[PDB]
RNA sequence: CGAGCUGGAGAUACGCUUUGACUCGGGGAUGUCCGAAUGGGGAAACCCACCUCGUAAGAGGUAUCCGCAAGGAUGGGAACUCAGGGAACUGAAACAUCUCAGUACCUGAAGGAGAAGAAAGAGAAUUCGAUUCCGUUAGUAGCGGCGAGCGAACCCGGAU
RNA sequence: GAAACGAUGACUGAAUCCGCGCGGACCACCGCGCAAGGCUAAAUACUCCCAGUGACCGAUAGCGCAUAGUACCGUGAGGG
RNA sequence: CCCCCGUGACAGGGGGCGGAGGACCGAACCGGUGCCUGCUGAAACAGUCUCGGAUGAGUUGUGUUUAGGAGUGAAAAGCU
RNA sequence: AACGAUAAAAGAAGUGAGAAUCUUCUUCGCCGUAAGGACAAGGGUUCCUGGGGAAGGGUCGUCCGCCCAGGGAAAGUCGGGACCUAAGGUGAGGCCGAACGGCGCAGCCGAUGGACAGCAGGUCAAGAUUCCUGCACCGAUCAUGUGGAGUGAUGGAGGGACGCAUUACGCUAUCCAAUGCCAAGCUAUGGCUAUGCUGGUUGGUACGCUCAAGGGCGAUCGGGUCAGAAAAUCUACCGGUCACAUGCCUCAGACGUAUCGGGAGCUUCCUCGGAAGCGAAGUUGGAAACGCGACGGUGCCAAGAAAAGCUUCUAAACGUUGAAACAUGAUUGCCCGUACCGCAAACCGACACAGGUGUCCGAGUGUCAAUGCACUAAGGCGCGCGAGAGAACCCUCGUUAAGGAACUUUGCAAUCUCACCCCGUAACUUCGGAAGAAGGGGUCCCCACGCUUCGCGUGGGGCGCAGUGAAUAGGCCCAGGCGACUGUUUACCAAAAUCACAGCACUCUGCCAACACGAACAGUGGACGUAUAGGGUGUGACGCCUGCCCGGUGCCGGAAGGUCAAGUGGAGCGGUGCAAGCUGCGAAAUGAAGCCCCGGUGAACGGCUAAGGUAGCGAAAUUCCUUGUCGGGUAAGUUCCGACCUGCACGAAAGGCGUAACGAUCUGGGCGCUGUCUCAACGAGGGACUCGGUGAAAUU
């Protein structure tokens, strides 16, 4: 609703269709969001209004800082229009206040979490996404990510109190196609409808299937896709 | 292609033999009792325009 | 050069020429606009500028890449040269190594030619004396699913 | 292949003239050579162009063209 | 949204008013069902009639991007 | 054979060597949400004038879009550039790459969008928001005057800046009516004598104490610097002080006065026909936008470009003795487009071709409405062969005795039905629907009376065989198969029971995400997203549900051991030399991922040996035998329905069973109606046939 960026549709990369499907949609404008919040430490802001943002599954709030300058911040479950919120280490474990994990007590439910002290939020940004604080380790804190993964995150990384807004994506039933069209392209096109030429499933004389593979090569159900990477060590217990 | 078609080039004799009835018949001409220039029977003489008296101009 | 010329053009008219036209040989001076194109833009041949000198007409400059600067490169060439990259049909009466072939093609640099060139060599006479080319050696030696098939070099004779 | 020698993309890594490479695994001997710096005419290849010639053609031949990359076909490259 | 009644375990039921819809009928427009005609065509895919959609997953201009084992595809190996 | 739509043509006059075809005249007929008119694209001189008449033109040409010559195209305000940015292109520096090259921040190019000053008439043979007349406006440089000190960026901020549907008030464009006005005449066939007939009936600008819907707006003092890199008087945040209706600022348009313009016609001259001069009226009433007032109102989710000009601010910097702003006169006015065709004979289709082609305007009457349909204005056409004939046969039609599906693969085809109003309306249901269900009645004219009309209601009377009197205009129903559903597809034999679908599941992915494009440690898509998100696969609304079998395959999980690569490691063997050496091959043991092995996993590949089918369905889109068997319907039923179970060979997300509604689906039945048929006939048109003109083809 206020001074934002222009979002342009595009589903093909440097030229060719990379991420399959994706195509329709009512056209949108990008809302600039303050994920980091770091430079606004010590300064308090008032929630002007909560808003609609078709770029995110969660609602967005408008902050009016004591210095004048306004910033669109993520809207948490509970935050009311006309509620005070402050950033910095010296902050309450109350809704909207942005503070790092060391000052965050054990068990406290948070959202919009960074990965490196800086850059900005990169975890629990979707609707109803919550991060459980399991405990402090060293200069690191063990946390439970929305999925259930237990990542070692350094206590130096910022966060926002409470879970995220936009209730629940359930009474959101879509309904009939076209709904899905006024977002992104004719979806999941069955490789079984395809041809030997097009996709491994394709061919035969009726309805079938015989090997269980995706578009290109691989295998679709159950096959670990992570690499033998560095960040593995900063993570304990994956599955679901 | 073209469903019914000829089977052989129709010979010079045969082809010509067919035209034996294409023979144009020359008009049975009579001379006008007046203006005296030929005219076709039951019609007006072209030259004067007479047909007992004068009907047509010039 | 020595009487004609006014292009093909066969075309009438105005003219020009022994103060030597015309044509032929050789230098110059002009040379719009595009095009490496080079002020900037561009759908080539068109748009829009700025700096300088200039009375306006008009004259010159403004691309990058090297080095102080003089000065050098940008692009273009029929084939021929060398370098980076490098097929398949085909033959093997099938095909896979092998063959086609380092052939075709692409690309880079370049010249009237290039490339190669002054033995850590050839080699078995303690012979030879930079390179290229031709003859020959010789279908030899040898390579090879030792299959199809591929195939040197020293010696000697010349071009230089 | 018994596969030397050259070449070098990767890891290494020397002798310096009673020193080094070479001579078809490798060794001894015997013999031939001085790498890791550059330059270098001429004989050779080609023919856009030029001139001369021909048991070359003479208008369905000869270049595609007695002249035209034109007319014509194709968005095009291209073809003609 | 405003008025009206009803409490057996019940729901809403009526009026007003509003102005929803991959709602209906149907031109433009987009499409191509069935027959016939056409079948050296008017036409290298059409004609008359009939028929499907017709506020949507809609139609359409201009500009621009993706191509040869490559593209594109509400998926026929379709289109390029 | 053909001469390119079945929208006709006819006669008269002219010209000319020659005329169905060219010209003129008077009729006819055809289109009129077009078959008129205006752009765009594209074409390129096709436009006009004057000539021509080989070829082109499906015939003929005296003619033309054809051949020749000459002409015509005029812009400060219209489109475009000297302005701006989108997708995309490009891109010094910077990132990658055997090459050539690929990427990329700023910037720059790029209209399809933003911005921006001119109206009304006149008129060449052919141009007109361009020329010409009338009266405007825009910026720029200077001149005289006003004013008397700021001006204000390459930076800030404000503003430009944006959806979809529905809709209230006023309005014009614009259209209709009249015994309103104005102008010309006349009319006779029977009448009318005007209260008939025909035509016209206001456009630009300036001024007003005139009417006016609608629309737009708050002003100012201060504080915090912690926000706009910094500054700012500007902008934002918080506070204090006058903010209801009122109130400011705007007038879309209407009116009045003037003025320039036009206006039906009228008047002479006329060189076969145009030119110059003149000029009447301007009313009352009804309708009316998709245009305007205008950035209105409301509702909605799918949440709706950017940049410049522009308005506000200070930094710099020049100057306050010549500021900006205002006013009036002079001056200034660049480049390209502009003819002509442009739903078509000038464009793409080889054709003067029955196709294709984006935007705008598109009148009247009748008709619920309308861009529908019939007739018709303006305007434009009769489609570049023609004339006779009136056989077969062919196409496109009209009627048809009795019969009415007997036709037939099949009611294929064609009838029937048809609008608006009123009554009435089933099973079944997802409570919306089914439903236009089915069935029935009405409908014209006139007079009276009642009301809300553009009309309607009641009452009475008339006329015809018939009253949506012509045109546009659903036939319906019972049951089943499949798919839920709108949708989508085989350009050019398949529209469907295929694909998509909302909904369900299995699964992978922790963010330089999996995954994808890619020379590449580039760059990018996924995503300026972050597990209520993204990839992949299967199934396919909804309802009830989804059994058993982990032996083989695959994925996920374990390690006690077997296996296993280069490399580390060299026991031992051997070559040569007198010799030290220099050399060829070289075990053991150790050495990762994999594979053997164990365990799990089925909305994994699968099965009905690892197990033998849980419901539910079953002679089925599945059934061989087979026209199974009995029943139904029929006069008679290889299909159809219903039971049955002996499932050659159903069965649970290659989903099982069922389902209201949906269907250009597919099957069976009934009503209706009918040339589908007994069984054909007659009638029309266009070919076929005949003359004159032009004159192909496969084939041989
Ligand atoms: Mg001859
Ligand atoms: Mg040539
Ligand atoms: Mg219809
Ligand atoms: Mg229908
Ligand atoms: Mg870019
Ligand atoms: Mg005839
Ligand atoms: Mg006769
Ligand atoms: Mg059944
Ligand atoms: Mg369907
Ligand atoms: Mg459908
Ligand atoms: Mg004839």
Swiss-Prot record, chain A:
GO MF terms, alphabetically ordered? RNA binding; rRNA binding; structural constituent of ribosome; transferase activity
Q: Which NCBIfam families match?
A: rplB_bact
**Which Pfam families does this entry report, sorted A to Z?**
Ribosomal_L2, Ribosomal_L2_C
Q: Give the top-rank taxon of the lineage listed in the UniProt record for this protein.
A: Bacteria
Q: Which UniProt keywords apply?
A: Ribonucleoprotein, Ribosomal protein, RNA-binding, rRNA-binding
The family assignment reads: Belongs to the universal ribosomal protein uL2 family.
Residue ranges, annotated region (Disordered): 182-240
SUPFAM superfamilies with a match to the protein in the record: Nucleic acid-binding proteins (SSF50249), Translation proteins SH3-like domain (SSF50104)
Residue spans crossing the bilayer: none
What's the protein name?
A: Large ribosomal subunit protein uL2
How it assembles, according to the record, is: Part of the 50S ribosomal subunit. Forms a bridge to the 30S subunit in the 70S ribosome.
What GO terms in the biological process aspect are recorded for it? Answer: cytoplasmic translation
**Basic residues biased stretches:** 223-240
| Matches recorded under PROSITE patterns | RIBOSOMAL_L2
An annotated GO cellular component: large ribosomal subunit
**What does the protein in this record do?**
One of the primary rRNA binding proteins. Required for association of the 30S and 50S subunits to form the 70S ribosome, for tRNA binding and peptide bond formation. It has been suggested to have peptidyltransferase activity; this is somewhat controversial. Makes several contacts with the 16S rRNA in the 70S ribosome.
Matching entries from HAMAP family are given as: Ribosomal_uL2_B
Query: Lineage of this protein's species?
Result: Bacteria, Thermotogati, Deinococcota, Deinococci, Deinococcales
From Swiss-Prot, chain B:
RNA-binding as UniProt keyword? yes
- Compositionally biased spans, kind Basic residues: 1-22
Q: Which Gene Ontology terms cover its molecular function?
A: rRNA binding; structural constituent of ribosome; zinc ion binding
Keywords on this record? Metal-binding, Ribonucleoprotein, Ribosomal protein, RNA-binding, rRNA-binding, Zinc, Zinc-finger
Q: Where are the zinc fingers (C4-type)?
A: 32-48
Give GO terms for biological process.
translation
Q: Where is this region: Disordered?
A: 1-33
Q: Where does Zn(2+) bind?
A: 32, 35, 45, 48
Instruction: Kindly list the GO CC terms recorded for this protein.
Output: large ribosomal subunit
Q: Where are the transmembrane segments?
A: none
Cofactor info, note text: Binds 1 zinc ion per subunit.
Domain of life the protein comes from = Bacteria
Cofactor(s) needed for function: Zn(2+)
Regarding protein family, the annotation reads: Belongs to the bacterial ribosomal protein bL32 family.
| Function comment | Forms a cluster with L17 and L22, and with L22, a pair of 'tweezers' that hold together all the domains of the 23S rRNA. Interacts with the antibiotic troleandomycin which blocks the peptide exit tunnel.
Q: Subunit details for this protein?
A: Part of the 50S ribosomal subunit. Contacts proteins L17 and L22.
What is the protein name stated in its UniProt record?
Large ribosomal subunit protein bL32
From the broadest rank down, the organism's phylogenetic lineage runs: Bacteria, Thermotogati, Deinococcota, Deinococci, Deinococcales
């Amino acid at each position: 609703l206020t001074e934002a960026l222009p979002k342009t549709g595009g589903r093909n990369n440097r030229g060719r269709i990379t991420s399959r499907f994706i195509g329709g949609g009512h056209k949108r404008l990008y809302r600039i969001i303050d994920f980091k919040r770091r430079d606004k430490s010590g300064v308090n802001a008032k929630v002007a209004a909560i808003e609609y943002d078709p770029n995110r599954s969660a609602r967005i709030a408008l902050l009016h800082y004591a210095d004048g300058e306004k910033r669109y911040i993520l809207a948490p479950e509970g935050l009311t229009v006309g509620a005070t919120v402050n950033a910095g280490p010296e902050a309450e474990p109350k809704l909207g206040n942005a503070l790092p994990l060391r000052f965050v007590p054990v068990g406290a439910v948070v959202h919009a979490l960074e990965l490196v002290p800086g850059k900005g939020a990169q975890l629990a940004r979707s609707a109803g996404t919550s991060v459980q604080v399991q405990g402090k380790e060293s200069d690191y804190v063990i946390v439970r990510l929305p999925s259930g993964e237990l990542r070692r995150v350094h206590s130096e990384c910022y966060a926002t109190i409470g879970a995220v807004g936009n209730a629940e994506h359930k009474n959101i039933v879509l309904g009939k196609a076209g709904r899905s069209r006024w977002l992104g392209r004719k979806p999941h096109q069955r490789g079984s409808a395809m041809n030997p030429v097009d996709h491994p499933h394709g061919g035969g004389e009726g309805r079938t299937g015989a090997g269980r593979v995706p578009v290109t090569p691989w295998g679709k159900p159950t096959k670990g896709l992570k690499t033998r990477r560095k960040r593995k060590t900063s993570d304990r217990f994956i599955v679901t | 292609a073209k469903h019914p078609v000829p089977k052989k080039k129709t010979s010079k004799s045969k082809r010509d033999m067919r035209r034996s009835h294409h023979a144009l018949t020359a008009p049975n001409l009579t001379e006008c009792p007046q203006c005296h220039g030929k005219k076709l029977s039951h019609h007006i003489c072209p030259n004067c325009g007479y047909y007992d008296g004068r009907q047509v101009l010039a």
